Each structure stands twice: as C-alpha cells, then as structure tokens.
Amino acid sequence: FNILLATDSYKVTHYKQYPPNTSKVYSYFECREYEETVFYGLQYILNKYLKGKVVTKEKIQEAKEVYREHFQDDVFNERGWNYILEKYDGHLPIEVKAVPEGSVIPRGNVLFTVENTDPECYWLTNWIETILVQSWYPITVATNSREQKKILAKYLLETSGNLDGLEYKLHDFGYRGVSSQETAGIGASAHLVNFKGTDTVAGIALIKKYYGTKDPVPGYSVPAAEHSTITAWGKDHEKDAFEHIVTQFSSVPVSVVSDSYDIYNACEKIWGEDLRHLIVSRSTEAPLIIRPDSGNPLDTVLKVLDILGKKFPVSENSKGYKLLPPYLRVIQGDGVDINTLQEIVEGMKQKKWSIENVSFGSGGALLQKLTRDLLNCSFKCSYVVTNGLGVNVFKDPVADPNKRSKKGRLSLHRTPAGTFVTLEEGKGDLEEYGHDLLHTVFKNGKVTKSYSFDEVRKNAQLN
Amino acid sequence: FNILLATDSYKVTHYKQYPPNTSKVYSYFECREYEETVFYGLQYILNKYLKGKVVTKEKIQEAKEVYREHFQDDVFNERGWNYILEKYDGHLPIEVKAVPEGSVIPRGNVLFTVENTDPECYWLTNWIETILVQSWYPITVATNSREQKKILAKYLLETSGNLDGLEYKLHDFGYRGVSSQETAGIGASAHLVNFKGTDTVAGIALIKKYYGTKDPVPGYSVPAAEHSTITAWGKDHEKDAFEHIVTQFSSVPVSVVSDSYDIYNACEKIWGEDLRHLIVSRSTEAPLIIRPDSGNPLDTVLKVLDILGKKFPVSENSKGYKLLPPYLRVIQGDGVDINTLQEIVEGMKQKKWSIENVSFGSGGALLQKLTRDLLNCSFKCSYVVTNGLGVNVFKDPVADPNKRSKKGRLSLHRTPAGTFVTLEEGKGDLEEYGHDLLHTVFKNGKVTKSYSFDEVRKNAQLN
Ligand SMILES: O=C(/C=C/c1cccnc1)NCCCCC1CCN(C(=O)c2ccccc2)CC1
Ligand SMILES: O=C(/C=C/c1cccnc1)NCCCCC1CCN(C(=O)c2ccccc2)CC1
Numbered sequence: 059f060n061i062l063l064a065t066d067s068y069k070v071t072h073y074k075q076y077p078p079n080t081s082k083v084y085s086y087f088e089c090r091e092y093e094e095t096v097f098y099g100l101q102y103i104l105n106k107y108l109k110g111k112v113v114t115k116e117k118i119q120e121a122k123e124v125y126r127e128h129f130q131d132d133v134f135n136e137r138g139w140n141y142i143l144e145k146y147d148g149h150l151p152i153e154v155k156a157v158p159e160g161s162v163i164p165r166g167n168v169l170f171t172v173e174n175t176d177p178e179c180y181w182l183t184n185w186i187e188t189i190l191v192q193s194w195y196p197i198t199v200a201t202n203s204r205e206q207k208k209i210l211a212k213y214l215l216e217t218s219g220n221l222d223g224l225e226y227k228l229h230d231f232g233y234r235g236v237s238s239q240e241t242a243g244i245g246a247s248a249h250l251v252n253f254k255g256t257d258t259v260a261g262i263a264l265i266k267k268y269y270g271t272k273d274p275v276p277g278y279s280v281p282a283a284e285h286s287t288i289t290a291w292g293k294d295h296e297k298d299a300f301e302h303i304v305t306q307f308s309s310v311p312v313s314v315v316s317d318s319y320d321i322y323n324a325c326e327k328i329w330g331e332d333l334r335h336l337i338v339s340r341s342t343e344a345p346l347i348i349r350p351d352s353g354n355p356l357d358t359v360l361k362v363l364d365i366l367g368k369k370f371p372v373s374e375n376s377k378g379y380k381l382l383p384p385y386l387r388v389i390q391g392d393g394v395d396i397n398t399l400q401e402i403v404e405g406m407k408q409k410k411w412s413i414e415n416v417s418f419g420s421g422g423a424l425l426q427k428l429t430r431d432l433l434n435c436s437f438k439c440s441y442v443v444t445n446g447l448g449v450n451v452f453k454d455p456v457a458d459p460n461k462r463s464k465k466g467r468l469s470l471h472r473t474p475a476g477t478f479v480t481l482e483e484g485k486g487d488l489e490e491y492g493h494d495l496l497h498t499v500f501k502n503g504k505v506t507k508s509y510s511f512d513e514v515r516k517n518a519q520l521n
Numbered sequence: 522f523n524i525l526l527a528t529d530s531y532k533v534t535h536y537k538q539y540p541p542n543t544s545k546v547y548s549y550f551e552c553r554e555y556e557e558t559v560f561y562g563l564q565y566i567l568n569k570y571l572k573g574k575v576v577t578k579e580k581i582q583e584a585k586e587v588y589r590e591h592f593q594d595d596v597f598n599e600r601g602w603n604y605i606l607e608k609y610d611g612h613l614p615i616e617v618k619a620v621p622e623g624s625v626i627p628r629g630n631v632l633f634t635v636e637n638t639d640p641e642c643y644w645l646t647n648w649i650e651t652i653l654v655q656s657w658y659p660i661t662v663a664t665n666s667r668e669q670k671k672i673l674a675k676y677l678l679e680t681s682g683n684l685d686g687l688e689y690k691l692h693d694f695g696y697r698g699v700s701s702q703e704t705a706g707i708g709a710s711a712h713l714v715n716f717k718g719t720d721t722v723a724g725i726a727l728i729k730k731y732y733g734t735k736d737p738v739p740g741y742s743v744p745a746a747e748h749s750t751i752t753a754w755g756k757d758h759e760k761d762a763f764e765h766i767v768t769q770f771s772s773v774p775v776s777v778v779s780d781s782y783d784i785y786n787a788c789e790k791i792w793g794e795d796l797r798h799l800i801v802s803r804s805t806e807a808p809l810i811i812r813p814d815s816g817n818p819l820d821t822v823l824k825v826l827d828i829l830g831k832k833f834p835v836s837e838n839s840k841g842y843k844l845l846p847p848y849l850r851v852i853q854g855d856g857v858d859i860n861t862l863q864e865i866v867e868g869m870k871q872k873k874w875s876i877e878n879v880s881f882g883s884g885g886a887l888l889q890k891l892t893r894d895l896l897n898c899s900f901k902c903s904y905v906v907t908n909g910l911g912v913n914v915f916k917d918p919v920a921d922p923n924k925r926s927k928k929g930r931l932s933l934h935r936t937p938a939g940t941f942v943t944l945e946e947g948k949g950d951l952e953e954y955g956h957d958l959l960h961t962v963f964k965n966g967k968v969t970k971s972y973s974f975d976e977v978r979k980n981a982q983l984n
Contacts (some may be wrong), residue, residue, distance in 0.1 A: 064722065066747075068745035075769065083749065086671070240702060257529045257530040281531060429889050430886055452752060454782065
C-alpha cells in the first residue's frame, strides 16, 4: 500500500498553489449542521495507513512514475516527499487531535483536526484529507446504527418494560451488501459499537486488530438457514428442511428463512401444525427464530405474528403487549432501514404486539446506502501561517451559507449546560470552557493515544 | 486475508442444512429484472480473493478459534475445510463460468455461475456467495457510470455534432466519498471502463494489476485547485490565488474552484476582468476550467455560463448552440449524479448551450451511493444433485413474485434478434440458441480466463 498515491489527484498539484511562505496548514473535520454523531474510526485509518514509516525510495519512485503518466507531466512533488523520507525516516510530520473514539458529539462540532508539524510539509495536511476523510463512513454507520438502536430502545422499553437483548435487536447482514471487503470490515465495526449481533465476521478481526476487545470477542451469531438450504430439498420437501434445520440445531437458537414459498403457509402449516412439536419442545435459550424476507416488512411481521399468535399460546406482558412463548421469536430480514425500522416497530405497537417478539436485521441500508452526504462529514482548512503570521481561513459560497466553514484554530469544549461547543479563532485559549476535549492522537507518524473497542462502547452508550 | 472468514456467519452453519447426500450445489448470479448491465469485477475478486492456495492449516485454525467464540460453540466445519487443504493444496474445488468482463448484458440474465467441482465440497459453492456477490458494486458503478455516459453522449452529439471529449465528461471525484480505500480502487476502476477522467489514483493501480492496460493513459487527470489552496490566501486575496494557479499551470489545462466566496463574482470580475488577460492568452490545449461547487447545479451552470459568455467571445457551433472560446471551460463537480446530470445537460440545451462548454464531476453518487439493491444483483442456487439426482431449485416468495429464482442449470445465449436469453432447466443442451456465451473463468483455484482492461473497455463501448 502506497500512501504517495492514496489521495485525490489534484492535491498532488496543491503544493504549488498555497500562498508562498506558508509554514502551516491547519485543517479540521466536522459533520456540519441526526443531531449527534458517534465519532468513530479515525484510529483505524491512522494505524493501517498513517502511522510508521509511510515513505520509501520505492514509494516515492512509484508515485512519480504514475503521476507522470497520469498527469502527462511531472507535477508530482518528489522533492517534498523525498524530504520527509530523509528528515523523518518516512514518518509523516503531522499532528492530529480528536475527540475520544465513540464520543457522541452534536452536529457542527470539531471532531478532529490535522496540521503539519514541520513547516516544509505545509502540503501534507490536506494531502491526507482524502485518506482521513473516509472516516465519515464508520462514523455514519456508527451513527445511523446507534439511531436505529434508540428507536428499538424507545419502543422496547415502552412495550416490555425494559431493554433486555436490546444490543441484539439489529443484526448485520450487509456483508454481501457492501462495496468491498475492507468496507465490510470497517462497517461491521461501526455497528458492533451499538449492537453485538453481526454476521459480517470481517468487522470482528478489524476490532481485535485495531481496537482490541477484552470482552469475549466483539459480536456474535446464531446458526440460520438461507434460501439455498431450504429450496435445495425441493419445493415439496420444505417441511423436510425446516425439520432438519431445527433438529441439527435443536442445540442452540436457530433462524430459518420461511419465505422461500408462501411465508404464511410455512408459518401456519409447517411450523404451526406439522412441526408444532419441534417448536414448543424447544428451549428459551435457543428458540426457533422464524425469519421471513418476502415483502413489506410491516404487514408481514404483523401477519406473521398474527398467524403465530394463532397457532401458538400468546400471552400479554406487564405492559399489555402480546408476547409469544419463549421458544418462538421473529427476525425481519428484509426492508429494514432506520426509516422502516420505525414503521414496523410502531406498527407493532399500534397492533399491541411487543417489540420483544421481534429482532431485526438490515443488510445494504445498514452497511451501504450511506454517504458522506448524510451527516455532512467535511474536512476544511481553517488556519494557515503565511509569512510568520497566521490567518483564519474558511469558505462561504454565496449560493450556500450552509457550507460556511469554521475559521481559525479550533478547540472542542464542554459548556456549562453539559453539552459541547467548538471554539474558533483560537479563542479556546482564553481558559474559558475548561480544557480542549480533543486529544493529540497522532504526531510524527506515531499513535500517541488510542482507545479500546470496549471504551468506544462505553462512550457511544445510550441514555 | 483469510477466505475462511469472508462469508456471512450463518453460512458457516450451512454445510449441515442441505439435504443429506448432496454432491453438487450450483448457483448463479443475475441482475434480477437500467435495462442492461455491464458485467465487470468478477475477474478482480477471483484473482485477489479466490485464486491460488486460499486455505492453510493456519487459516483453518484461526477460523476455528474465531468461529468457536463467535457462535459460542464449534459449528465450524474444519473437517471439510481441512479436506480441501489436502486434496487440492488449498485450492478451491469450484468452477465459475461468466460473461466477458465489460459485457453490456441486458437485465434478467445469468451473468456468472458457480458450482463445486468436487462432490465433497457441495457446501463450498454458496460459502463464497458473499465473496462473489460484492461484485454488484463494480458492476453497478460500471453500469451507472455508463448510463450517465449515454446522457452525455446523447446531448453532446445533438449540440456539437460529434462525440469528442465524451470520455472526459464525467470526472471521478469520489475518492473522498467511498466507504473505504479498497472501494475507491474497485469503484474508480468501474468508472474508468466508461470514461478516462479520474482523480481516484487508486483505481488505476488495480487495473494494471488485475486487468492490465496496454493503452497509454488508463486514467487521466489535470491539475486543479481545491478550497484550501484558495481560501488560504485570505478572502481578500482570492484574485491573488486565482492568478497564482493559472500561472503555475499556464501550460496545462488547469481547473480552479470559484465558490469560495461568491461564484458569480469570481466569474464576472475575477476571471472576467482582473485576470481576463490570463485566460484569453491560453492554449486550447490548456484551458482554464472554471469550476463552481455550490448552489443549484443547474441554475449555477447557466448563470455561470451566462456570465462567462458576457465576459468572453462566445461562438455558435454548426448545430446552433453557443460555445465559449477554446481556452475557457466549465467543470460541474458537485451535486452530479445520473438524475441531475440529465437535468443540467437538458437544461443547457433549452438554454442554447453546447454540452461542449461543460464537463461534469461526481463523487459520492458516482462511487458511493449505490446498492446491491439498484440493479437487483442477486446470487441464488438453481440446481443441486442429491442422491445422484439433479433437481432444479428456486425460490418463489409470495408477496414478491419478483424475487423469483431461475431453476436448473443455466446458459447465456444470443437470440436471432441479436439480444440475449438465459436458458433454464438445462434446456441449453438442446443446443438451440448457439453456444453458451459464458466462459469458464475459474477452475480448481485457477483463473482460466481473464480480459485486459482494453477488452472490457471495448465490450462496455456504446452505441
Ligand atoms: O443466522 C442468522 C443470520 C441471518 C441472516 C439472514 C440474511 C443475511 N445474513 C444473515 N441469524 C439472524 C440473527 C439471529 C441473532 C439473535 C439470536 C438470539 N435472538 C433471540 O433469541 C431473539 C429474542 C427476541 C426476539 C428476537 C430474537 C436474537 C437474534
Ligand atoms: O481535477 C479536478 C478535480 C476536482 C476535484 C473536486 C473535488 C475532489 N477532488 C477533485 N477537476 C477538474 C479536472 C477535469 C480535467 C479534464 C481536463 C480535460 N477537459 C477539458 O479540457 C474540457 C473540455 C471541454 C469542457 C470541459 C473541460 C475536461 C476536464
């Protein structure tokens, strides 16, 4: 992996564009105003791509050779890169401060800043805006995931009386759904920050590898059928497969796609009559989690429950919402995203069903269908030293005041009302709102401070 | 990278959910019924994740351990995995036939298929469903980008008269916006199949590494300004900044953002007056490319052009559309996706403007913002051999008969009307619509057939 060619091409040409006599280029990152975001993931990109010796004779030469063909000219700054190579044995001469991983900071706040520690590397700061900006992703997943949690929390509480198994309500299916493998990892981790139910094994490694979990492994998973494992017995032997999968895994909790063919038959005939004996005989610690993924998450859950409440002994819980016997539960495989999640869950409430009966699972929406647009994650330059004297820089397009960028040296502070506040123009040095909450996490190619995935949990915690 | 950990979790439990005595699991990939897709991406996946020795006692042991704690039990099949390590020196006993990379195959056709070559590894086929399925991305990005190419070609022709510069009308600005690093590589590579303008350096490397290019410039890019390189000069020195960039790159086409502060000032005054002499004196082979980046993408382009035509000598090309002097062009790099693209270009026409004047730029929408959902990319099983008996498998969910699944062995064919037709139930053997268009591309861990990015290009070509 070469960092020399891991940025947006035109930046390779920025070094010549900054005012002459520029010693410092201070840049920050924020989710311009989902009122609060989970800041998570920077630590990953810092260890995997930024720390250590990132420059090498071979990497400086590879760059030139490419940018030579790419730009049909030698625009590439081999001069400046080669400088970093010798002067600091390839380590990047930049400082990066940030809010502790997992922090839930409201929109408009400085989550992390990047600046060059060596005056000649005034071009490095923004060079890495790209590589570093891709954190918008894990942050977004992390945020959106955590928002879907509150929705399940709000409704589980005002329906069951508590939050048992909350952390296992949104299961990550999106492994096949993501754009790449690496993404599968990163995204899976921005979920395990809010729930422990994940099928995208990848996100786990990353965690143990870049964040470390003292707990017994990050997320988990129960065995489950897929369309191939049931359609393979032939449409006529669907029963044979259902009964083979609940028996093979009579052991632990098993999930079984019941919509291969008429989801409402499988529920009313196969599970509620033929294999009635393999359900009721089950353990509460290992129920048969019926799983449809046919059409319209709301109407199906309701009808599924309706059918099941009818072939099985339903009970009314402390709050009045109907509840299936401990050996029968349901998971919403398809159509679930932060928006529909809200529909289904409230749709159940109106229908008196308890959010207990059902646990959900989102694929693409959960790990894809996310953009740097959603939370307005942006990396803009606010401070710069031109000729020994700094100047507060920022952009303010006319056709868009929403795109005004902060100006000057920034600092994150807790306000007397408990919330946060991002101070600009260096005013954070007036000793006003306590200490800056951002922490130097990166300086001269060496991770100066990291958090464990267990810490990220505690930070991103709800309520 | 351990292939034994690149699959949905439940699939780890799958091996024991198939009917007893199943020697063959054969599945297919299709873009369930964007009327035609570009099949691109399989070749990379095969090469980077499935080729060669993908199994090692170390990777089996790792999985074992991880999986054991994941499912809090050992449902992990090391016996069958261990089998492959021995029998075929860690090489996957599976065969994958597919359509030539770049193939613009309509919708509802079998693009690629998979099946285990060893009756012992019947379970293996689906295992890698996840791995393979992630191709929806490269397919989708190569497909969506191509569609946008059409909208561009369509109006460029009906406005300039030809298709010159077409392959540079959509510059990839999404490196900043993709979910991860590995994504930008894949994404950008799918874009480059349809255009040659990309700032996502990453993609090029992947091409030369997994597809190879004999061509000179597999991906081109000119120097450009970014907000930091301008705003750093201070609001009151935007002119100083503009005049500095045009000078540094007076010889080559240089793009320069102008919405730092008032896009309509930098155009009517900064470039139209204070620095006119620096634009009009430029080579056509190195124009100044004015680039707005905020405001209504259409309203802005028109006013931008309206200002420029009012400050520079505009001509009227044959077709009757207005055209700016050869040294002055516009690059619309914000808010451009297939929809808006189609609105702008269309809006430029009603307003008598040649698509020659503008060149677009998309990022988030181009590479990110696409889902396995869009083209209905799906991988399902359609044929299996149980007790030496082949059965045509399929799912036909009610409440969404649109998720139906083809049945039996498939083959791609070209119908006498020139288009394509996917044959099911093994009816392809009746040898009627010529030979199967699918070529075996992967046998027992060996790429038996790949295509140069030059061929893919020729396949994905338009008209
Ligand atoms: O194996 C699959 C993966 C399916 C899939 C499908 C498609 C793509 N990719 C993966 N299982 C689905 C997650 C099961 C995890 C837990 C088990 C324990 N559990 C309950 O006991 C329960 C209690 C109350 C309410 C609901 C459930 C909550 C849910
Ligand atoms: O390099 C950037 C990068 C912007 C950016 C933004 C955000 C993030 N990352 C990067 N933007 C401008 C580069 C486009 C270069 C090509 C040169 C050849 N060309 C024309 O000569 C022309 C002919 C006719 C009409 C229009 C143009 C078409 C445009």
